[PDB]
Symmetry: D2
Subunit: 303 residues, 4 copies
């Protein structure tokens, strides 16, 4: 393996071209993004056989400083005329390979830095502010792109993936986990009604990578829509395990978005331990945080 790059390249742009014309689905109010504030955290990795002597001999002649890669990314967010993180990564990748002929491969990760709407009152009326936003530490969109230079000097996208990360959902009832193996190592009681608490990271791939860019917005799949499908399916489903749930979320996503080829899940189980099972004259219960070990599941659904 031989590559190098820059991580945690934060870049915030005001007034990016708005994303409009996105096809709505019944699960979600999402129709677009105003892009008054657009934040991204970029990681760039580059490779090429001509980088070898930078390692083996300390020769810096063909080293683009990682600091310069940071400058490259920040300047390109200023000149970017598109509407999505996916398209931004393509712009950066293409631009970087066009600039630096000795680089044969570039891999980019972009993570949205999400902001939420806030409200303000003017002359007695409360409305969404176009100026003040709330920084969210909750779920966020992601994008990944790898691009290579071929021997005939064409540039080709070899991998593209979009995602939603950091989604933490708890369903207070309507979840079971029963029927699993009971042997000498099993102490977990069967539970016909648990408050299943899952962390979800959901990633999707498009049949046609161009659809990821947002250039034809009707084919774009927004992370916000994926969020709302996940919460709707969780609500609707009498879950039988996390495994069972994520398969059903995946199926619904692929149904709603025939332009997608696959959906990949990484889930974790953070369900609370029960402390008080019955409260007089109430349906309520009390739970607390578990010990650190957490279950996880990984599964791909294909179109």
């Amino acid at each position: 393996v031989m590559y190098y790059g820059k991580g945690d390249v934060f870049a915030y742009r005001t007034y990016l071209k708005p994303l409009t014309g996105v096809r709505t689905i019944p699960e979600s109010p999402f129709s677009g993004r105003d892009h008054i504030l657009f934040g991204v955290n970029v990681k760039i990795s580059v490779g090429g056989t001509k980088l070898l002597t930078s390692f083996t001999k300390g020769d810096n002649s063909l080293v683009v400083a990682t600091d310069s890669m940071k400058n490259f990314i920040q300047k390109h967010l200023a000149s970017y005329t598109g509407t999505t993180i996916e398209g931004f990564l393509e712009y950066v990748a293409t631009s970087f390979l066009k600039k630096y002929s000795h680089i044969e491969k570039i891999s980019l990760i972009g993570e949205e830095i999400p902001f939420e709407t806030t409200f303000a009152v003017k002359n007695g009326n409360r409305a969404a502010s176009e100026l003040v936003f709330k920084k969210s530490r909750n779920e966020y969109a992601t994008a990944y792109l790898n691009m290579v230079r071929n021997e005939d000097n064409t540039l080709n996208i070899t991998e593209q993936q979009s995602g939603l990360a950091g989604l933490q959902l708890i369903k207070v009832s309507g979840n079971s986990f029963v029927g699993f193996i009971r042997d000498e190592y099993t102490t977990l009681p069967e539970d016909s009604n648990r408050p299943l608490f899952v962390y979800l990271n959901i990633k999707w791939k498009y049949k046609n990578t161009e659809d990821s860019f947002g250039t034809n917005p009707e084919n774009y799949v927004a992370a916000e829509q994926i969020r709302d499908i996940a919460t709707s399916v969780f609500h609707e489903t009498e879950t039988l395990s996390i495994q069972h749930l994520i398969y059903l979320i995946g199926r619904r996503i692929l149904e709603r978005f025939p332009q997608l080829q696959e959906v990949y899940f990484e889930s974790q189980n953070h369900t609370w331990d029960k402390i008080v099972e019955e409260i007089p004259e109430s349906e309520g219960k009390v739970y607390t945080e578990p010990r650190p070990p957490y279950g996880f599941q990984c599964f791909t659904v294909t179109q």
Copy 2:
């Protein structure tokens, strides 16, 4: 100093009695909490002269185990018939002092563990779920209470404070910071239009401690309302510094809630560094994360 206790006592309750009937204000449509899910992180500290030998002699005779304090809190969340964190702390404090005659003082901190509503579809109609919630790592309510046993065996609240922590707000324009001292130590340029990014922790005290419990909801001041005041005032104000902003937020809070005696602010400056000042054919700019040092301000406004 001589006390001991338990921290990070997480307790989650389903179907707490709903908070209803809260008086609305122009800045906020908040009227109550459904309390399908109610999460709190409690810290309990206790003292009393009779604890001395637990330290000086290793005599555990009058040691309530910290593990038992944890059990005490969790059990009391199950039996609590009220509607606020403030009220819950009063219930635990009074109960604990009534139980353990050798304890002369109890301090409690409670921090809300916040959950947000999510969408689900039934019959093509998207509505808020009553089952599925999103764990939020953004702002959260807080409460503080200290209670002492007097020499005549009466129990007295000696301090009470409510709060909102973890609010992170950025206003993209309509902020300045000019006119500060310029001497041998000053390198900061004056900025007539900065994208001010502040972290806010806001705490209030009531004139009458009883109003904090929520038993008469008309007199209760909800953290959600304070949040909405802060965003509205930030939007409305051409800020001249964070100092200037927090004073104005404070004044608006005390105007809206005459039952409050004071509001206390701890703010931090996290404003991004500008990288690209002018983008062709756009109002946009590009910013990035600053170096670690952060400014802060601390200020009390009184009624």
Copy 3:
């Protein structure tokens, strides 16, 4: 309350004047500090009635920018000719109040950023390197200093404290916790031999503030020596609780350092849960991490 300032002011200095001429104690081999590399994280807070209009009117005329405070601290670490973080704080404080006559009070916290010795082979032998250091995320020394300008324009130190933070110590056997209250809230079993795991934060106060600066280093009390007293007393003691342990550590500190007035402890219990009590043919056991709630104790020992 009314103050403002700067936090996370990191500053790294090479070749600070070494600390030597210290007075030894039986528990510790500590003999001074080389100071090839000296790192500090400083927080500065300033106050004064003349700052009021910076809040109430947005008048920045008498505002020292927090960015300028950062510059002040960093420049002063360059010119500091002493040997201790405590002395550095006094130097900054005095210098700041002298520069800014409208400031009435300054509070400083300094936290050591610790580095550890590494070894290298050269010229035929393995020896301590004078160039390569390992950054440590373990325990670190602390210092606190407040200074005021009096009505007559003279300066006084109004509080000084030194400390050790982040010490995490586990004793595998020779600890008990028995004899505590067993009532309707108790589920903790008595344990005659537990692997007590404590987090310790230890703060001390000198009778004479001058002894904290290092100017007469024989009177200085080093965090390294305090660490060594803590580990020694923990080993020596059949502990009966954390309360019992910290009292004994405090007594030892005050016996070894008669120039101290008092020592304050903040301890936390992070003792592991037992999984396997008996292992065939071995004295070993197996333990795991507990649920999040942690016990804590706060205790002052005075001469």
Copy 4:
């Protein structure tokens, strides 16, 4: 993809069989591990085609509960008679596949939870304690192992790697970074003498998997030895870039351990920004923390 498992399975064991009989190298005084206290954090992932219906149908018949996997790992740490984390992983893997014939693949990651020696005074002298240990949050050893069940129910190891994570080393002088590309994206000045601060994660792979287990300990490669090579080479080298440094470290590792097939580096650059370059009557300087973006390098050295 289809797999599931448990993360953050902490297990602490006292009195594991000591590691001794290791083969020394010039860079390291390492001579073994006492194993009075041995801590590991294990992640387990399992897969196999027979798990499909747990996802597609909610059928838990062939599901080993992740909680059971946690129990399995903890109980196996009690019965493990070996001397290395690598050997522990092999023991767990073999045992698990033997127990659960419907599982086709198991992956394990083990991370050391490191403890450091402390000293105590007893019987007249200060000596290393056999009872009290300091938990370290610095560098730690790692191990990876994957195992498969083939058609004939035979088991094979399919991947094995050992490593050292979390090493943070700063060298105050004797580092340059000059001669890199200076173009329209470059603002980094050349630096003939910088205080290079690198984070290092180093992974190695043995020619013969058996050498990783400790069974013939003279063939074992200890993380402690690798650490000591890294510090020595960093000290010895007038570095020309991080790329240049890690190549040299890798060459030294492979020269010292001919039983290794390759060594892989992940490095990051966290070098401080300079604030004061010249101090009167001193060789010292002052530096501070940089903005968040960090350079990184990824490189494999092979025999």
